Amino acid sequence: SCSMPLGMQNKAISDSQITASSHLSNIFATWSPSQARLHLQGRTNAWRPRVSSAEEWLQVDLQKTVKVTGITTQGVKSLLSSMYVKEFLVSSSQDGRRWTLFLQDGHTKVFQGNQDSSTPVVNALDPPLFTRYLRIHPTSWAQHIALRLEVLGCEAA
């Protein structure tokens, strides 16, 4: 049903394929883009931008055209409790330079994301994307932006 994980949880998507607008890093911690993997545990187990604004994004380069049918999101809990993205936008690209915002009924689609730190939330993409690159744009969050992600889809051919 073209809904299988594309490699965030299982590392078929390598660390170098995951980038972001910024990430939170200092002399203690590193919430790197490549930590944005569904169900990841261990230290600093999510992507966090350096500051939480509505201009941040997490990018995945799938390295080939894929039929992308869904996106799964999760937050994270740290010492300062629960952080999660409540709402987000999606954009996509074939070349990584020109980006197309995902729409519903001709208007920007706001996806409803998480309401806690650990439960995964699956969002279908209808119409599906035939694309190489994806960006997640947080627009509402609890405490701070933090994300663990899976991308769902299949090889079109």
Author numbering: 2173 to 2329
The paper states:
Association of fVIIIa to membranes is coordinated by two tandem carboxy-terminal C domains. The C domains of fVIII, termed C1 and C2, are 16 kDa β-sandwich folds that share 66% sequence identity.
Analysis of surface electrostatics illustrates how OPLS binds to a positively charged pocket in the C2 domain centered on residue R2320. Real space modeling of the OPLS ligand positions the carboxy end of OPLS 3.2 Å and 3.0 Å from the R2320 guanidino group. The carbon backbone of OPLS extends away from the core of the C2 domain, adjacent to the solvent exposed hydrophobic loops previously demonstrated to be an important determinant for PS membrane binding. A single interaction exists between the Q2213 amide-nitrogen and both carboxyl oxygens of OPLS with additional polar interactions between amide side chains of Q2213 and N2217 at 3.7 Å. The OPLS group is situated between two loops, L2210-G2214 and S2250-S2253, forming noncovalent interactions with Q2213, N2217, S2289, and R2320. Although the structure is high resolution, poor electron density is observed for the two β-hairpin loops, indicating high dynamic character. Two alternative conformations for the 2197–2200 loop were resolved in the final model to account for the flexible nature of these hydrophobic loops.
